[PDB]
Motif scaffolding. Structure first.
Motif, PDB file in Angstrom:
ATOM      1  N   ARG A  82      -0.431   7.462  35.759  1.00 33.85           N
ATOM      2  CA  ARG A  82      -1.844   7.605  35.352  1.00 33.85           C
ATOM      3  C   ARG A  82      -2.606   8.482  36.341  1.00 33.85           C
ATOM      4  O   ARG A  82      -3.534   9.164  35.918  1.00 33.85           O
ATOM      5  CB  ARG A  82      -2.574   6.255  35.291  1.00 33.85           C
ATOM      6  CG  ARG A  82      -2.111   5.363  34.143  1.00 33.85           C
ATOM      7  CD  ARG A  82      -2.704   5.797  32.819  1.00 33.85           C
ATOM      8  NE  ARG A  82      -4.174   5.751  32.782  1.00 33.85           N
ATOM      9  CZ  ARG A  82      -4.881   4.680  32.469  1.00 33.85           C
ATOM     10  NH1 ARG A  82      -4.309   3.550  32.119  1.00 33.85           N
ATOM     11  NH2 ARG A  82      -6.208   4.790  32.472  1.00 33.85           N
ATOM     12  N   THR A  83      -2.240   8.420  37.617  1.00 34.46           N
ATOM     13  CA  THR A  83      -3.044   9.053  38.666  1.00 34.46           C
ATOM     14  C   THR A  83      -2.898  10.564  38.664  1.00 34.46           C
ATOM     15  O   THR A  83      -3.874  11.252  39.002  1.00 34.46           O
ATOM     16  CB  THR A  83      -2.766   8.409  40.023  1.00 34.46           C
ATOM     17  OG1 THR A  83      -1.352   8.548  40.158  1.00 34.46           O
ATOM     18  CG2 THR A  83      -3.345   7.018  40.015  1.00 34.46           C
ATOM     19  N   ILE A  84      -1.760  11.062  38.207  1.00 32.54           N
ATOM     20  CA  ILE A  84      -1.465  12.482  38.283  1.00 32.54           C
ATOM     21  C   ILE A  84      -1.011  12.996  36.923  1.00 32.54           C
ATOM     22  O   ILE A  84       0.148  13.237  36.698  1.00 32.54           O
ATOM     23  CB  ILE A  84      -0.510  12.775  39.447  1.00 32.54           C
ATOM     24  CG1 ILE A  84       0.714  11.872  39.519  1.00 32.54           C
ATOM     25  CG2 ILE A  84      -1.297  12.653  40.776  1.00 32.54           C
ATOM     26  CD1 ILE A  84       1.602  12.261  40.672  1.00 32.54           C
ATOM     27  N   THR A  87      -2.675  10.133  32.469  1.00 33.01           N
ATOM     28  CA  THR A  87      -3.739   9.520  31.677  1.00 33.01           C
ATOM     29  C   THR A  87      -4.120  10.417  30.521  1.00 33.01           C
ATOM     30  O   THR A  87      -4.441  11.581  30.802  1.00 33.01           O
ATOM     31  CB  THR A  87      -5.015   9.267  32.470  1.00 33.01           C
ATOM     32  OG1 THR A  87      -4.734   8.400  33.582  1.00 33.01           O
ATOM     33  CG2 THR A  87      -6.068   8.655  31.563  1.00 33.01           C
ATOM     34  N   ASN A 266      -7.227   3.173  42.459  1.00 36.99           N
ATOM     35  CA  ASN A 266      -6.979   3.728  43.761  1.00 36.99           C
ATOM     36  C   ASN A 266      -5.878   3.045  44.555  1.00 36.99           C
ATOM     37  O   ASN A 266      -5.372   3.653  45.493  1.00 36.99           O
ATOM     38  CB  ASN A 266      -8.330   3.710  44.525  1.00 36.99           C
ATOM     39  CG  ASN A 266      -9.117   4.935  44.243  1.00 36.99           C
ATOM     40  OD1 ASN A 266      -8.967   5.923  44.971  1.00 36.99           O
ATOM     41  ND2 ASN A 266      -9.894   4.921  43.181  1.00 36.99           N
TER      42      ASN A 266
ATOM     43  N   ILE B  23      -9.509   8.734  44.719  1.00 36.00           N
ATOM     44  CA  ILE B  23      -8.989   9.588  43.657  1.00 36.00           C
ATOM     45  C   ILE B  23      -9.777   9.317  42.390  1.00 36.00           C
ATOM     46  O   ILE B  23     -10.320   8.218  42.215  1.00 36.00           O
ATOM     47  CB  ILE B  23      -7.491   9.386  43.366  1.00 36.00           C
ATOM     48  CG1 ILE B  23      -7.177   7.950  42.929  1.00 36.00           C
ATOM     49  CG2 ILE B  23      -6.624   9.804  44.532  1.00 36.00           C
ATOM     50  CD1 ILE B  23      -5.755   7.764  42.431  1.00 36.00           C
ATOM     51  N   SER B  24      -9.908  10.373  41.573  1.00 31.74           N
ATOM     52  CA  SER B  24     -10.574  10.370  40.300  1.00 31.74           C
ATOM     53  C   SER B  24      -9.666  11.077  39.290  1.00 31.74           C
ATOM     54  O   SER B  24      -9.749  12.292  39.097  1.00 31.74           O
ATOM     55  CB  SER B  24     -11.891  11.126  40.328  1.00 31.74           C
ATOM     56  OG  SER B  24     -12.697  10.618  41.356  1.00 31.74           O
ATOM     57  N   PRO B  25      -8.671  10.388  38.695  1.00 28.39           N
ATOM     58  CA  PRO B  25      -7.708  11.074  37.842  1.00 28.39           C
ATOM     59  C   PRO B  25      -8.348  11.788  36.668  1.00 28.39           C
ATOM     60  O   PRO B  25      -9.376  11.356  36.189  1.00 28.39           O
ATOM     61  CB  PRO B  25      -6.804   9.928  37.399  1.00 28.39           C
ATOM     62  CG  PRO B  25      -6.965   8.888  38.481  1.00 28.39           C
ATOM     63  CD  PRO B  25      -8.420   8.961  38.856  1.00 28.39           C
ATOM     64  N   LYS B  26      -7.682  12.834  36.214  1.00 26.72           N
ATOM     65  CA  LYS B  26      -8.115  13.571  35.046  1.00 26.72           C
ATOM     66  C   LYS B  26      -7.545  12.934  33.782  1.00 26.72           C
ATOM     67  O   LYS B  26      -6.515  12.281  33.840  1.00 26.72           O
ATOM     68  CB  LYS B  26      -7.688  15.030  35.191  1.00 26.72           C
ATOM     69  CG  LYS B  26      -8.244  15.637  36.477  1.00 26.72           C
ATOM     70  CD  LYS B  26      -8.104  17.067  36.538  1.00 26.72           C
ATOM     71  CE  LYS B  26      -8.577  17.708  37.819  1.00 26.72           C
ATOM     72  NZ  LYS B  26     -10.007  17.480  38.126  1.00 26.72           N
ATOM     73  N   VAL B 350      -0.388  19.537  41.179  1.00 26.14           N
ATOM     74  CA  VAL B 350      -0.856  18.359  41.933  1.00 26.14           C
ATOM     75  C   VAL B 350      -0.898  18.646  43.438  1.00 26.14           C
ATOM     76  O   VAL B 350       0.135  18.856  44.017  1.00 26.14           O
ATOM     77  CB  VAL B 350       0.156  17.214  41.691  1.00 26.14           C
ATOM     78  CG1 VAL B 350      -0.284  15.969  42.417  1.00 26.14           C
ATOM     79  CG2 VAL B 350       0.435  16.916  40.223  1.00 26.14           C
TER      80      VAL B 350
END
Ligand SMILES: Cc1ncc(COP(=O)(O)O)c([C@@H]2N[C@H](C(=O)O)C(C)(C)S2)c1O
Ligand SMILES: Cc1ncc(COP(=O)(O)O)c([C@@H]2N[C@H](C(=O)O)C(C)(C)S2)c1O
Lengths: 398, 395
Positions: A82-84, A87, A266, B23-26, B350
């Motif tokens: 999800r973080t990279i 999502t 996070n 972090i603020s994911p896309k 990334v």
């Protein structure tokens, strides 16, 4: 020693021999038709009381169609955590729908109920915190706590007198977290949140509830144990639950403040370090939440079925261990007798799995039956007939 | 007084923001493909793990659809109770055949496979020898065990030998490594580790998340690549979520391993089995790679091209050996700025810095796939040239 450190097959053999000696070796059954209240095992149709399919969703066409829609649109895989870049819009769609259903500002989905516990407990807890855990908490709670540096205390099951004794004796300047299953997986009882949560306020503790077996079962339209006791907007109640039982998919979730969601994004290690769920999974769960709004009477049917089955087992002479939910254990005592009764029930056309130590105490082996909204009266009465025949044969009922 | 939940959350979120690690994911707005959409724009996607181009492939989608329709949305139980169905067994047989191992077991993720298999294998008095740079999920799996834990310097077989000599046991010695290291794209030296294991009576455990579908004949994986897939004292764990473009993890090895895991692995005992659409897609994937083995070839062609062009611009790809192609930026702020500037050019990759990677070794991680075309890779190279010149990493 002389021959050197063990090879793999030797380590395996030693552990498998040990398990067979301890009566713990398992040979699970293979189901040969869909997850329904009637299914096929070993070439035979059977009444299935073994699954967690509380609402009859696991093979429901409405879920299957929404799954298919999302599969076709988006594909077979997310391709990332999800973080990279894992999502997608559909993840967020489900989180928003879950939050709306639960009545919380926000919701976050993790890869299972098992990993949700690890991730949420690990994000919340720090060295010098104190946790107060119910004696009978799920294994996934135990593993989540073991990865933290918090001080861990255990309170006797549902014993709020004991919990208060520990809360008096053990203080901290950080976080105090009282951790409980909402519905206990094996005995089918409900955590006494009506007492725990006021106690929490008196000692400035936060309460964490893993409501895997209350989601889709307790509360208005299955909104869960926390909702049932009226605490779903309390920010010092953390709600975890699973998407794999009533909701009949896979996944775990947390529900609460935008800022809690942000902490988990996070910090929760299974969220940071594992792939997001694929479209077919998410579309089915969106389907599930739409269907329970369309057919909320499923929950009523579940409970009608439950009360019937429990009353008729008691009339035969069985002990269902004070169970309160559709989880309806039948006590057999020793593990061998539970396993033999399970075998004999299968001969009669009834599939329910025996459970013994170490999952449940010595002398409290049982068969766990889980009643669902999709069982009919004739299916339940067939199961009851089988339990009567087997119980008479084994000399546990008259 | 104590902390309340909002206070603990605020404390931890403020901490991460002060450290520059929040972090603020896309949110991706189109399917997982080598071109996709982020923040309302089309981008060349170098931030997926979709090595073989399977994530949105109609063949996987059709097999998924078939199994969804036949069997439903959910399994409704753990494998041990009422959650094993015919299709789980079908996938395990197909996987073992493809891997060349005696057996295969599917678990809920690569993350949980590591916990389950390390937990099942290890006991108090065993000694583990872990590579310095092993994945976080290996760490968590080891932390749940009572084994003695030693760390060898990354890929340093001299160091590993020194430890194996000094730390004997009557139980199990387990040498634990990533097969392909997630950040740097280098390959574990199993051609030296496995002989060393034989000399000191150790078992080898390989987390081949980034090797499965990538290395070895037809993508059979790192252990297959080094010729050790039939060795019962080599254990493989990997993910079904990257090349195989689903979710799940697997453990593959000797028949007896599978029996142990069924009885002992905690994420197997205590979590629900995967649903028909997921299993059907993965059966699809194994059929597709047998039908289109040229995908693996294309993946490697694409990789060699991208790497050589980046070298020609003057970038350092850190000795990476796989489609994982890091580009060195040095410090974390410069890597993050480069990632932002690449995105403005329509290229999505990334940025990674300390603590995930060493100080001075911050990078942008790019993963090349079989589905990237020449024009996509050249668009990426064009953006790297422009951004690199602008930041003075290249001439
Ligand atoms: C060596 C290794 N093992 C297991 C997993 C987890 O597999 P899963 O649970 O998704 O099946 C990963 C993931 N790779 C991701 C990435 O490289 O982008 C990650 C964000 C670093 S975690 C890994 O690199
Ligand atoms: C309280 C509680 N929390 C989490 C999970 C894990 O959720 P999952 O990872 O499947 O989403 C379970 C599961 N229940 C299963 C069952 O009761 O049949 C179990 C086989 C005992 S594990 C649970 O009881």
């Amino acid at each position: 020693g002389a021959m050197g450190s063990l090879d793999l097959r030797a380590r395996v053999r030693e552990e498998l021999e040990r398990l067979k000696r301890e009566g713990l070796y398992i040979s699970p059954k293979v189901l040969e038709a869909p997850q329904e209240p009637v299914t096929r095992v070993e070439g035979r149709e059977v009444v299935n009381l073994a699954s967690n399919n509380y609402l009859g969703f696991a093979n429901h066409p409405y879920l299957k169609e929404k799954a298919r829609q999302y599969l076709e649109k988006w594909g077979a895989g997310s391709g990332a955590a999800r973080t990279i870049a894992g999502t997608f819009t559909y993840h967020v769609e489900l989180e928003e729908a879950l939050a709306r259903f639960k009545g919380t500002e926000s919701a976050l989905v993790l890869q299972s109920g098992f990993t949700a516990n690890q991730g949420v407990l690990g994000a919340l807890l720090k060295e010098g915190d104190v946790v107060f855990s119910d004696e009978l908490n799920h294994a996934s709670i135990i593993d989540g706590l073991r990865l933290t540096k918090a001080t861990r205390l255990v309170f006797r099951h549902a014993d709020v007198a004991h919990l208060e004794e520990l809360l008096k004796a053990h203080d901290t300047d950080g976080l105090k977290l009282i951790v409980t299953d909402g519905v206990f997986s094996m005995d089918g009882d409900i955590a006494p949140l009506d007492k725990i949560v006021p106690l929490a306020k008196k000692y400035k503790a936060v309460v964490y509830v893993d409501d895997a077996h209350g989601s889709g079962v307790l509360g208005e339209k299955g909104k869960g144990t926390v909702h049932h006791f009226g605490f779903h907007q309390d920010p010092d109640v953390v709600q975890v639950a699973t998407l794999s039982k009533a909701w009949a998919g896979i996944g775990g979730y947390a529900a609460g403040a935008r800022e809690l969601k942000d902490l988990l994004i996070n910090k929760a290690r299974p969220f940071l370090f594992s792939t997001s769920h694929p479209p077919a999974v998410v579309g089915a769960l969106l389907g599930a939440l739409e269907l329970i709004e369309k057919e909320p009477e499923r929950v009523e049917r579940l409970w009608e079925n439950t009360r019937y089955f429990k009353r008729e087992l008691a009339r035969l002479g069985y002990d269902t261990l004070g169970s309160q939910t559709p989880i309806t254990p039948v006590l057999f005592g020793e593990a061998p007798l539970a396993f033999e009764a399970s075998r004999l029930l299968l001969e009669e056309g009834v599939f329910a799995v025996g459970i013994g130590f170490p999952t449940v105490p010595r002398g409290k082996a049982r068969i766990r039956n889980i009643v669902t909204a999709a069982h009919t009266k004739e299916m339940l009465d067939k199961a009851l007939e089988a339990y009567e025949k087997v119980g008479k044969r084994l000399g546990i009922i008259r």
